Design an enzyme around this catalytic site. Structure first.
Site, PDB file in Angstrom:
ATOM      1  N   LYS A 156     -33.462 -56.763 -15.522  1.00 21.51           N
ATOM      2  CA  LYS A 156     -32.860 -55.445 -15.396  1.00 21.51           C
ATOM      3  C   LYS A 156     -33.931 -54.451 -14.975  1.00 21.51           C
ATOM      4  O   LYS A 156     -35.108 -54.610 -15.306  1.00 21.51           O
ATOM      5  CB  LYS A 156     -32.203 -54.991 -16.702  1.00 21.51           C
ATOM      6  CG  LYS A 156     -31.065 -54.004 -16.513  1.00 21.51           C
ATOM      7  CD  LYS A 156     -29.781 -54.713 -16.127  1.00 21.51           C
ATOM      8  CE  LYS A 156     -28.747 -53.732 -15.609  1.00 21.51           C
ATOM      9  NZ  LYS A 156     -27.406 -54.360 -15.492  1.00 21.51           N
ATOM     10  N   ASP A 210     -26.399 -51.125  -9.645  1.00 21.92           N
ATOM     11  CA  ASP A 210     -25.867 -50.858 -10.975  1.00 21.92           C
ATOM     12  C   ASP A 210     -25.454 -49.393 -11.062  1.00 21.92           C
ATOM     13  O   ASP A 210     -25.214 -48.758 -10.031  1.00 21.92           O
ATOM     14  CB  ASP A 210     -26.886 -51.218 -12.058  1.00 21.92           C
ATOM     15  CG  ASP A 210     -26.237 -51.458 -13.409  1.00 21.92           C
ATOM     16  OD1 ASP A 210     -25.658 -52.547 -13.602  1.00 21.92           O
ATOM     17  OD2 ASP A 210     -26.278 -50.557 -14.268  1.00 21.92           O
ATOM     18  N   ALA A 259     -13.961 -50.882 -10.869  1.00 26.69           N
ATOM     19  CA  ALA A 259     -13.532 -52.095 -11.556  1.00 26.69           C
ATOM     20  C   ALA A 259     -12.084 -51.989 -12.013  1.00 26.69           C
ATOM     21  O   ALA A 259     -11.299 -52.923 -11.831  1.00 26.69           O
ATOM     22  CB  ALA A 259     -14.455 -52.379 -12.741  1.00 26.69           C
TER      23      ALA A 259
HETATM   24  N1  LIG Z   1     -26.068 -55.672 -12.804  1.00 29.48           N
HETATM   25  C1  LIG Z   1     -24.876 -56.156 -12.117  1.00 29.48           C
HETATM   26  C2  LIG Z   1     -25.259 -56.876 -10.822  1.00 29.48           C
HETATM   27  C3  LIG Z   1     -25.165 -58.392 -10.905  1.00 29.48           C
HETATM   28  C4  LIG Z   1     -26.526 -59.060 -10.900  1.00 29.48           C
HETATM   29  O1  LIG Z   1     -27.288 -58.867 -11.869  1.00 29.48           O
HETATM   30  O2  LIG Z   1     -26.832 -59.778  -9.924  1.00 29.48           O
HETATM   31  C5  LIG Z   1     -24.060 -57.082 -13.011  1.00 29.48           C
HETATM   32  O3  LIG Z   1     -24.564 -57.478 -14.063  1.00 29.48           O
HETATM   33  O4  LIG Z   1     -22.927 -57.401 -12.650  1.00 29.48           O
END
Ligand SMILES: N[C@@H](CCC(=O)O)C(=O)O
Ligand SMILES: NC(=O)c1ccc[n+]([C@@H]2O[C@H](COP(=O)([O-])OP(=O)(O)OC[C@H]3O[C@@H](n4cnc5c(N)ncnc54)[C@H](OP(=O)(O)O)[C@@H]3O)[C@@H](O)[C@H]2O)c1
Length: 418
Positions: free
Chosen positions: A104, A144, A222
């Site tokens: 993250k 994000d 979403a």
């Molecule tokens: N942070 C977003 C992007 C996906 C990823 O981490 O690739 C999620 O968790 O859906």
């Protein structure tokens, strides 16, 4: 008192681990992120001054492969939140069986007051600061909160400039625009995964969704896409939608396209023509068969848990149900889809995009949809089988599956000997 996010994540992990056989050393390893990087992000302001921002990049675990996670541009962003979200991303990528770890990012910044030039400078400076810990096979960022594909394109361009085009610079980051290493089906990934999980849950419960009612809480990307996909693919009746301002009730059904147009034209879904106006606090208790909270977290608490009437609760958002509410809903016989299993479609399509970038060959919409369907169906059925074997909660079963996969990967590498 302050309820630190990382503390809550560790508590959740302990609760999960108490339901399975895991060594103490592996649990202690999992309680702490394997690498945390905090950097300064200096950019040039449009007035000529130089402002320094704080950026984060937490890689919780990479036993199963390169870490995966998004970047959040929020004024109230802290290191604790990044660590907790990386920890949750570990289990998210583990439950859906991806060769990924947990990661993250985040920058403490208010992007609403930044211009386009300043946003591009911020993205490029963040890449220049965190280049040493990211890569196509090391750490793949993603969009994000308050981050879009435009920032992804800027970040990928900066990474390619620094890397001197010595490899697949497209695959260093996902969520990019279709013109530059993009993927088809990225926009509706999370909702498509949620719809697949809802369909599998209905299949498990023996109820057909054709003609049924669905209520969606939160009408962002979403929530809108979840309602639309439910109405089209699942044949369900979108009976109620809502946002921060208020909610809509219509027994005859709501057209998601019409509601989205109204929201775009008036800024909110309040006072939709020919519809009853309600709020979230009675929307969550409407008599429906599928309830999909797709908004701010912690909307179902012990206060309203006993009043929920949905047969299926699909946690599209990130942790919208409290553990007490989890116990109450399980006592009522309501099948809950865990938060990091329902919205695993977005990270799955991100993985598909990364595979396309790495391979140099790009797929079509149908191929991506079919692969996502297979992955989400398999993950949900594995979680439900664990939930049926161990006689535990659905969230507990998903935690068991993800932590077991991570623990097996750690044991195979020799990181933990027990
Ligand atoms: N942070 C977003 C992007 C996906 C990823 O981490 O690739 C999620 O968790 O859906
Ligand atoms: C980027 C992540 O994807 P995402 O689509 O999940 O984020 P998102 O696009 O920001 O979705 C946020 C949605 O949830 C709503 N929301 C925010 N706080 C709420 C609250 N306290 N109560 C009820 N609804 C609330 C938002 O309504 P509003 O946009 O109308 O505030 C919006 O509909």
């Amino acid at each position: 008192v302050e309820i630190d996010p990382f503390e809550m994540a560790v508590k959740q992990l302990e609760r999960a681990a108490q339901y399975m056989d895991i060594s103490e050393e592996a649990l202690e390893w999992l309680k702490k992120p394997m690498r945390i990087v905090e950097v300064s992000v200096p950019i040039e302001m449009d007035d000529g001054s130089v402002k320094v921002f704080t950026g984060f990049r937490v890689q919780h675990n990479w036993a199963r492969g390169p870490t995966k996670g998004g970047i959040r541009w929020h004024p109230a962003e802290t290191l604790s939140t990044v660590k907790a979200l990386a920890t949750w991303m570990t289990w998210k990528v583990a439950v859906v069986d991806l060769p990924y770890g947990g990661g993250k990012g985040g920058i403490i910044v208010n992007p609403k007051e930044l211009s386009e030039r300043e946003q591009e400078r911020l993205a490029r400076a963040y890449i220049r600061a965190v280049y040493d810990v990211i890569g196509p096979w090391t750490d793949i960022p993603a969009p994000d909160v308050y981050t879009n594909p435009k920032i992804m394109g800027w970040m990928m361009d900066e990474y390619e400039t620094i890397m001197r085009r010595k490899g697949p610079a497209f695959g260093v980051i996902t969520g990019k625009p279709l013109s530059i290493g993009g993927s088809l089906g990225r926009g509706t990934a999370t909702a498509q995964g949620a719809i697949f999980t809802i369909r599998e849950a209905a299949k498990a419960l023996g109820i057909d969704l054709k003609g049924k009612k669905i209520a969606v809480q939160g009408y962002g990307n979403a929530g809108y896409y979840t309602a639309k996909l439910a109405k089209e693919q699942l044949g369900m009746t979108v009976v109620a939608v809502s946002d921060s301002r208020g909610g809509i009730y219509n027994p005859d059904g709501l057209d998601p396209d019409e509601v989205l147009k109204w929201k775009r034209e008036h800024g909110s879904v309040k006072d939709f023509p020919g519809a009853t106006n309600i709020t979230n606090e009675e929307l969550l208790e409407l008599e429906v068969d599928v309830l999909a909270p797709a908004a701010i977290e912690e909307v179902i608490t012990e206060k309203n848990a006993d009043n929920i009437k949905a047969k299926i609760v699909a946690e599209v958002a990130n942790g919208p149900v409290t553990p007490e509410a989890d116990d109450i809903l399980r006592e009522k016989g309501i099948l809950q889809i865990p938060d990091f299993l329902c919205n695993a479609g977005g990270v799955t399509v991100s993985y598909f995009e990364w595979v396309q970038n790495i391979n140099g060959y790009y797929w079509t919409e149908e191929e991506v949809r079919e692969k996502l369907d297979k992955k989400m169906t398999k993950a949900f059925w594995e979680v439900y089988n664990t939930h049926k074997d161990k006689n535990i909660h659905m969230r507990d079963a998903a935690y068991v599956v993800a932590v077991s996969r991570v623990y097996q990967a750690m044991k195979d590498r020799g990181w933990v000997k027990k």
